[PDB]
Design an enzyme around this catalytic site. Structure first.
Site, PDB file in Angstrom:
ATOM      1  N   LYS A  61      63.644 -11.351  80.799  1.00 33.14           N
ATOM      2  CA  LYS A  61      62.314 -11.513  80.230  1.00 33.14           C
ATOM      3  C   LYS A  61      62.216 -10.758  78.919  1.00 33.14           C
ATOM      4  CE  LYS A  61      58.659  -9.304  82.241  1.00 33.14           C
ATOM      5  NZ  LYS A  61      57.502  -9.213  83.174  1.00 33.14           N
ATOM      6  N   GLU A 105      51.469   0.353  81.571  1.00 30.07           N
ATOM      7  CA  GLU A 105      52.877   0.117  81.839  1.00 30.07           C
ATOM      8  C   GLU A 105      53.577   1.440  82.118  1.00 30.07           C
ATOM      9  OE1 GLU A 105      54.915  -1.451  78.420  1.00 30.07           O
ATOM     10  OE2 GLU A 105      54.626   0.437  77.340  1.00 30.07           O
ATOM     11  N   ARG A 106      54.703   1.353  82.816  1.00 30.73           N
ATOM     12  CA  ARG A 106      55.506   2.538  83.079  1.00 30.73           C
ATOM     13  C   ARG A 106      56.092   3.101  81.790  1.00 30.73           C
ATOM     14  NH1 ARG A 106      55.873  -1.356  86.273  1.00 30.73           N
ATOM     15  NH2 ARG A 106      55.788  -1.287  88.563  1.00 30.73           N
TER      16      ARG A 106
END
Lengths: 512, 475, 51, 479, 141
Positions: free
Chosen positions: B154, B180-181
């Site tokens: 992705k 997000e991480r």
């Protein structure tokens, strides 16, 4: 509906022109008490998250500042507090000590020891709620943690700086996985003089009872494991704020190892009792609830807690802080609020099941749902070479599992998959408080994947493995030292391994 | 204006002013502690008091603490200087490379384009990917769902889309990470710096020179409180509207997850005390999603395409979040590890993928025919595989073996390399126009290239290269 | 031989019907889940506002 | 003594106004001018010298402005050897109609748990005479035990069997606490304890009584009582046991029936006390209110309390918050099922949900551990063929699978046994199966030295001799 | 009459009533007309929004009880006036989006209990190729 300033003892002063507001911003009077909450009038100047102290020596945290009152959560019972008491500010935000004085010690959520061995030296006292590291200071995960379990070290690897959730049902072996991860570091810490290749450990307990915290401490003292770990205990008798704060205290204790170029692994046991405590504090501070009555600051809570787990770059020191939060699922449904929030927060998942805990598959790890978003990057090549094969083999077994009850009628090319899957599943079984090293793991998994167990009775594999281990640890320590030093399984070491396996099989006799 | 804090309830700060209250959505700066704290107004209450949501933590705050009113909402900087940079919701950089020296600033709360300033002519977006341009054609001013996690390619699909749209359409791009991480953000930043999407060149004095890049970044970190993660996508959307309106470009806008946007909205509504809706979501769900997504459209100057990653909780497509998002989605792009295991990359599932533009009016009545023919072929090959799993591949007719051959040939033809994966693999990149893809699919379905081998299709980006590989593999 | 052929056909039809029933039950399950969530949440809210 | 005035009355919640010297929380207040004795327990402070309390008895007949007297201490229960052989209420008052308790001491029901420094003892094995219990879920001598189950699965029957098989042989004392159970059950327990020598009542010519001996104490907070009583009766009994633990240093047994009622009796009043409800109607202070109880129940270096708690599980849902939280507080677990009781297998213990901290090779040897794990593996293997059997049939199963099914069915029927208290249901006599006998029989059945025997020879036996005898009888009656 | 997703919720609540008021001129002047509300579920969502923001008590699927009245106020105006009232008319083609073809929900049944017919549409026939995908066993009049 009346305000604390509108009670009929102050208005007798205001109406009388009394201007005795010289009562400082430090002192206030209790107005209401109940269920671990207090409500004060005054202290215009107190910070949020600040500690306050009552007449009877007890202390509490001020959380819900309001226009007319101040909301305080108590670190204890309510019998000590009564309306009309006086409260004074300490002036310092909640903090905890940090240093090597905590290694081998059990402490509460405020550093106050409960071992009964003495006080705690502390040259450094760190805050409990801090900002997490950014993006630039961090580093990519490229180093393994070596839990000591075969299934984890092979198929669900855990790296230094990772956050690997241990999710499962009650009585599956979660505390056992954690304690094995703690115990496996003994040989690595004792086999080194430098404090940069070691791995220290912190075990936060929430909602647990003392009669099992003591068993954990006993099990680690039997094996001399406490010398490189420390326990933080916030049990059920301890109030909700302490159960709520213990994980942050553990993260504060681990930030010392992270920032100083060392490595730690922190283990939050029953985070769901943390969230529970927060709910119990919000519904009593009359905060607005959400679904399952949890407030909206739960995702933010677990995120603040878990985003400190990191791997710092070589300019900060190169340290790390791994995390292994534990979660109980009440029916296996991981679609609930707290499970979905934590799997969204975490870098992986170890899903334990109950149907496999009774089939002899212990640890009962379902490798179908267990994943690791880091992956082979947290594995030595010696483990890659066998895991890349075993993952495919077990996936094929999972594709042809239901045919095990009909394999008598099938043909070849489908019974070999069943046989290899059964052999590997019986190989990955393990004993409680008996972890292995990565070299032995590589050797055993080479024996497994290379077909030296297909023609055996599965019930004998537990013997096979054991004997092979003793054999190699008696005879070919050079192979283990080479695998541990080079971190590779070269063709010459592989030939030596096949030689040793053939010698073992020749020396021994098995059923099938 | 200047006001004072009166109480602090988590991320909910109530502030008192003496005169000339600030409007809603305006920004307020707290004064008297480090870690510069910004508060976005959300509600008036009376007594010259207002309620505000904090963009950062509230620990260490005091009642009576002084607050300044900036006089306008959160203002993000805009320009070509934001290319290659990272920015938070308040516009500040978190990349440790200096401040953003931009000559302009835009509010994150902007009215959507009117009914007149909107383009009635739809048009595809020439990406350069074969499966995409064939079976799930994108559109300008469109919104494309991207259902897929990791282990599928992705990030590489993202970088390829960015590079190709920058090369061909000349338009820059933006990536927004909504909760997000942090390690994932670091990995993405390093992958961009490796693949050339970002050009961070040191200077002599010690500064950096972000020269011609192809993507800005806006990160609302997961450790950030609710209120930032809800107002991050608006920041990135204004950063993209700058390029759309003034520069007159056709830009992109990638969103790491819209479900965390919805989570943040629900959290903020719970903090502010709004009664939740059916499944806990806020009562302003469709309204907020529309305030966001109605700015992502085409106009007479330029356009903004968007690639939103979606997470369906518990595989429930009837949940209000995805049920409200699919109404706005003009396409869909599913990934699968069951095609990446075959070595195919991109791992786009040509059957699960859909689009509203595949109808035979925008693409002519040959694209539609080719696409439906390929879908029929792949369904037939799926059924033949389910049969061969039991009855073996000996009981097949010649037409069935021809169908299997054509299906495998087109399934491996749709794979192609990437310009960005060059540094990882050495295999070069292959742009593929749509007429070329259509002709190749026509021939493969006609049965002309049935004499070719299987592995000649897997690597290539056109019939010419496929026939060349076959000629050279014959040796 | 005819028996075994009919057995295979019946297993095919049964698997198809089971897939259909699984789809229907999945829809019903998601509906009931949403209903349970909404009911519990409305109960909590009415108990929070009935003070 | 202070003096206060009732201000308002809402069900089991009473607001009280004092002019000065407010009482601490949890203190006891006595209403003056009422028909019977009425005690209130302070729960919250509201402001303006006002407190909010919970009544132990019904508030019917109460008046605003009625006078209230603070006692200066929480509900003090009498203690000593004078409570032995005797029944008591939540407030220590006797309800046995035999005279007042001539106790020389009283303890407050509200105390602080023993600290971490007061460690437990070794995991002593407890022999109950029950087979599945002694085999798969060994009960600890100094730890907590849980009996989870809905209605009609044999909880109070199992507790009565445990009482008959443990309390009579136990040399120390024992306590029973009925928390919102049936009064018929209370009467039956009292009569059976008077019968079997656990209570020794001796009436005297001068109208008094003599409970000399009588190594048992009873406490009751039954369904008829309101909330406030059902909650605090457990603390009452637990203080009565803590007395024997701490001072006399004795080993103590503590049986509790329907501890779930405690939680229910919290949820009945929390919303009146102004708390917001939790997920499914329970109170927010569920975990803390349960842990403050459970942590007081633990072995120390002065004594030991072996506790056995029966946990109602509504609708057979183990996911409910109350049992979900209670599971973490227990050393030994025993979950009863309806699907098993439908087969006439009594006790209806599910050996795949029952667990124990004691089942480890270092505590119980490998002959026990491997046997238990093999039994569980066999039963799971049998469970993993139910669908194949229901769809296809036994004809498709191999002879290995048929052997597995036969052995699993034999184990299922063999774990059943008849109790002494179930004579009035089954008519059969009771059995006491020792643990070596259980292990021998299980090893034999798993090894395959009883496949020649039938299956119906197991469902009422307490060993292999009885199995062979029943098979012999059925074979003789067959011809 | 446009009240789009960017527009506030009161405007989506109104726009149907504004269109019906625009059509009442044709209904009352002897003319004929037809109004097409392309989304009534969004009107109901906006009314639910306004009610929950007004602290009103939710009900089934969080919708209040005034949703039937909301839709019926609007749809009962569609009428064929008589010979003495001019003779005009006003039809109405309200539109509803479902979720997995479920018509046993609350809003579809609330509107089916108001309407004089039903035109059903399926995703199976639309993916096969039958377009317009108008089923005929479920559609009635």
């Amino acid at each position: 509906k009346i305000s604390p300033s509108e009670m009929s003892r102050l208005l007798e002063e205001r109406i009388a022109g009394w201007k005795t507001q010289t009562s400082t911003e430090e002192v206030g009077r209790v107005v209401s008490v109940g269920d671990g909450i207090a409500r004060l009038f005054g202290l215009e100047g107190v910070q949020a998250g600040e500690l306050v102290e009552f007449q009877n020596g007890m202390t509490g945290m001020a959380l819900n500042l309001e226009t007319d009152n101040v909301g305080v959560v108590i670190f204890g019972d309510d019998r000590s507090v009564l309306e009309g008491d006086s409260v004074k500010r300490t002036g310092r935000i909640v903090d905890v000590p940090i240093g090597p004085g905590l290694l081998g010690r059990v402490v509460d959520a405020l550093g106050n020891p409960i071992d009964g061995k003495g006080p705690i030296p502390a040259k450094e006292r760190r805050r409990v709620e801090l900002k997490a590291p950014g993006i630039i200071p961090r580093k990519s995960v490229h180093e393994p943690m070596m839990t000591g379990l075969k299934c984890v070290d092979a198929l669900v690897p855990v790296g230094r700086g990772q956050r690997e959730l241990i999710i499962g049902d009650r009585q599956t072996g979660k505390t056992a996985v954690a304690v094995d991860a703690i115990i496996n570091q003994k040989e690595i810490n004792d086999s080194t003089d430098d404090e940069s290749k070691k791995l220290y450990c912190i075990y936060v307990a929430v909602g647990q009872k003392r009669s099992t915290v003591a068993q954990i401490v006993k099990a680690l003292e039997q094996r001399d494991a406490m010398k490189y770990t420390t326990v933080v205990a916030a049990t059920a008798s301890e109030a909700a704020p302490l159960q709520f704060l213990a994980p942050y205290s553990g993260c504060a204790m681990g930030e010392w190892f992270r920032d100083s170029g060392r490595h730690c692994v922190i283990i939050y046991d029953d985070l769901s009792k943390q969230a529970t405590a927060y709910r119990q504090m919000s519904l009593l501070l009359r905060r607005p609830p959400g679904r399952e009555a949890y407030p909206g600051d739960v995702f933010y809570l677990h995120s603040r807690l878990l985003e400190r787990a990191a791997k710092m770059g070589d300019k900060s020191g190169g340290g790390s802080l791994t995390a292994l939060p534990v979660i109980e699922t009440q029916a296996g449904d991981v679609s609930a609020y707290i499970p979905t929030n934590v799997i969204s927060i975490t870098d992986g998942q170890i899903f334990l099941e109950t149907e496999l805990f009774y089939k002899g598959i212990r640890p009962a790890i379902n490798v179908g749902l267990s994943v690791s978003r880091v992956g082979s990057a947290a594995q030595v090549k010696a483990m890659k070479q066998v895991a890349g094969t075993m993952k495919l083999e077990l996936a094929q077994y999972r594709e042809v599992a239901a045919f095990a009850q009909f394999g008598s009628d099938l043909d070849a090319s489908t019974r070999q998959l069943l046989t290899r899957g059964t052999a590997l599943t019986e190989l990955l079984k393990q004993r409680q408080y008996s972890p292995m090293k990565n070299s032995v793991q590589v050797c055993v998994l080479y024996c497994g994947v290379k077909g030296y167990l297909d023609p055996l009775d599965p019930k004998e594999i537990s013997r096979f493995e054991s004997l092979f281990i003793d054999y190699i640890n008696a005879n070919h320590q050079d192979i283990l030292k080479t695998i541990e030093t080079e971190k590779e399984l070269s063709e010459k070491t592989e030939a030596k391994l096949r030689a040793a396996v053939d010698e073992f099989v020749a020396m021994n006799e098995f059923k099938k | 204006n200047h006001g004072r804090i009166t109480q602090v309830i988590g991320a909910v700060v109530d502030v008192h002013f003496d005169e000339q209250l600030p409007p809603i959505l305006n920004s307020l700066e707290v004064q008297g502690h480090t870690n510069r704290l910004v508060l976005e107004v959300a509600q008036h209450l009376g007594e010259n008091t207002v309620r505000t949501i904090a963009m950062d933590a509230t620990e260490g705050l005091v009642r009576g603490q002084k607050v300044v009113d900036t006089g306008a909402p959160i203002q993000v900087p805009v320009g070509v200087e934001t290319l290659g940079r990272i920015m938070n919701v308040i516009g500040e950089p978190v990349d440790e490379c200096g401040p953003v020296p931009a000559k302009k600033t835009y509010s994150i709360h902007r009215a959507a384009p009117l009914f007149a300033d909107q383009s009635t002519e739809p048009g595809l977006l020439q990406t350069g990917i074969k499966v995409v341009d064939l079976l799930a054609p994108y559109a300008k001013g469109g919104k494309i769902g991207l259902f897929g996690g990791a282990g599928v390619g992705k990030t590489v699909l993202i970088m390829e889309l960015i590079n190709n749209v920058a090369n061909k359409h000349g338009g820059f791009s933006v990536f927004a990470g909504v909760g997000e991480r942090t390690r994932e953000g670091n990995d993405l930043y390093h992958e961009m710096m490796t693949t050339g999407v970002i050009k961070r060149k040191k200077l002599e004095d010690g500064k950096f020179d972000f020269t011609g890049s192809k993507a800005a970044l806006v990160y609302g970190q997961m450790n950030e409180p609710p209120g930032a993660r809800a107002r991050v996508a608006l920041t990135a959307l204004s950063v993209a509207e700058y390029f759309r309106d003034e520069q007159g470009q056709d830009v992109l806008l990638f969103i790491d997850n819209i479900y965390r946007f919805t989570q943040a909205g629900s959290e903020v509504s719970a903090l502010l005390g709004r009664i939740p809706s059916a499944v806990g979501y806020q009562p302003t769900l469709a309204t907020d999603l529309g305030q966001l997504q109605e700015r992502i459209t085409t106009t007479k100057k330029g356009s903004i395409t968007s690639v939103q990653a979606v997470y369906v909780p518990a595989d429930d497509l009837t949940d209000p979040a995805p049920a409200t998002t699919f109404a706005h989605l003009d396409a869909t792009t599913v990934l699968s590890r069951q095609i990446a295991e075959l070595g195919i990359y991109p791992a786009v599932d040509p059957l699960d993928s859909t689009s509203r533009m595949l109808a035979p009016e925008i693409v002519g009545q040959e694209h539609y025919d080719t696409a439906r023919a390929t879908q029929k072929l792949l369904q037939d090959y799926k059924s033949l595989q389910d049969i061969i799993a039991i009855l073996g591949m000996d009981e097949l007719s010649e037409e069935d073996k021809l169908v299997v051959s054509r299906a495998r040939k087109i399934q491996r033809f749709l794979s192609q390399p990437f310009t960005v994966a060059e540094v990882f693999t050495g295999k070069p990149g292959r742009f593929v126009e749509l007429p070329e893809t259509i002709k190749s699919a026509q021939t493969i379905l006609r049965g002309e290239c049935d004499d070719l081998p299987e592995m000649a299709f897997y690597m290539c980006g056109g019939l010419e290269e496929v026939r060349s590989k076959a000629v050279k593999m014959a040796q | 031989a005819s028996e075994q052929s009919a057995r295979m056909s019946a297993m095919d039809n049964a698997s198809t019907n089971a897939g259909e029933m699984i789809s229907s039950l999945t829809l019903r399950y998601n509906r009931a889940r949403q209903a349970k969530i909404t009911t519990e949440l409305v109960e909590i809210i009415s108990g929070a506002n009935a003070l």
